[model samples]
Target: GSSGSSGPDVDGMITLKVDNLTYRTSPDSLRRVFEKYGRVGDVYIPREPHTKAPRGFAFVRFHDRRDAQDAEAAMDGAELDGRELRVQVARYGRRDLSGPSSG
Candidate 1:
């Protein structure tokens, strides 16, 4: 749910929805790209539930909310690996307050 504002919520963190990612896109590689804008926190690429393969999209979280917004504006419609990337502020899910789980 949006806060009815055109910016990140109170938290200084933001999630970016990255699309058109190549099948071989590695989380580390994606992180490296986003790191150019600011501190990247987590890069999650969902796997196909049936095939267990890369789902062709990713959700990237930035430690700084502004960084995420800037990246969204800078990277949206940018090309990556011969594919046009679609970057946007993700408007889904609740912030995970528990932080990264000890895995």
Candidate 2:
């Protein structure tokens, strides 16, 4: 369901997506740096089995859009273990993660 016209107004909070990573950095490390912009609801860094490490990307949820934007501004060029972070506002699109969609 797209919610057609009625949906949560893009006001209070938002999520941010980041890409280009090198290693499985600790979540605590991310939180420490990320919290400066806003309160984080969660961070998801997909795991890798081949190297048993984290993929070069992550997603963060914020309680405020201002925080999200601030985080992006702060972390866009930030580095961790020699890897620069690329932060951006999360653009939510339609998808079926649970099952196939109906026609």
Q: After superposition, how far is residue 102 of candidate 1 from its true place, in Å?
A: 36
How accurate locally is residue 38 in candidate 1, as Cα lDDT from 0 to 100? 91
Which 10-residue span in candidate 1 carries the lowest summed lDDT? 1-10
Q: Pick the candidate with the highest TM-score.
A: 1
* TM-scores, all models, native as reference: 0.72, 0.61
Writing each residue's lDDT as its tens digit, candidate 1 over 26-50 gives 8898898889989787889888989
Off by over 4 Å in 1: 1-12, 94-103
Q: Cα deviation in Å at residue 99, candidate 1?
A: 21
Q: How many residue pairs clash in each candidate?
A: 0, 0
Q: Write the per-residue lDDT of candidate 2 for residues 39-67, one digit (tens) a residue.
A: 78777776676775676667677775577
Evaluated at residue 95, the lDDT of candidate 2 is 23
Off by over 4 Å in 2: 1-13, 49-52, 91-103
